[PDB]
Ligand binder design. Sequence first.
Ligand SMILES: [Cl-]
Length: 129
Amino acid sequence: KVFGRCELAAAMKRHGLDNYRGYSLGNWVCAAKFESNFNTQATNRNTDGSTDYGILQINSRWWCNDGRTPGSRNLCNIPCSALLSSDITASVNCAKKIVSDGNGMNAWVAWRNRCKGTDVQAWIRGCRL
Ligand SMILES: [Cl-]
């Protein structure tokens, strides 16, 4: 599923990510924009041999099982394909786990390099929430 900006903001808000661990909704929308262009089916292989899945490009090294990442930890206890569904519930609940980990949203390199420190509220501009 390719989400619209305000559509995704609406879904993330309903799943409790606005101000989750102190991160405002626009931080989450901005991250999804640059990780996946709001496409739940996005996948990208990492140099270490792991793969990133879904709207927030959650990796198979620590977080989900994709059966081809040696050393995998599957901390969200899910197959990585669940992260690709049109229903973003699995992605959001896993992200909740990641952002609580210790390094916050710095866990997502695109957030750190492209959203962090910027006017992230713009990402929810115009949206009815
Ligand atoms: Cl846009």
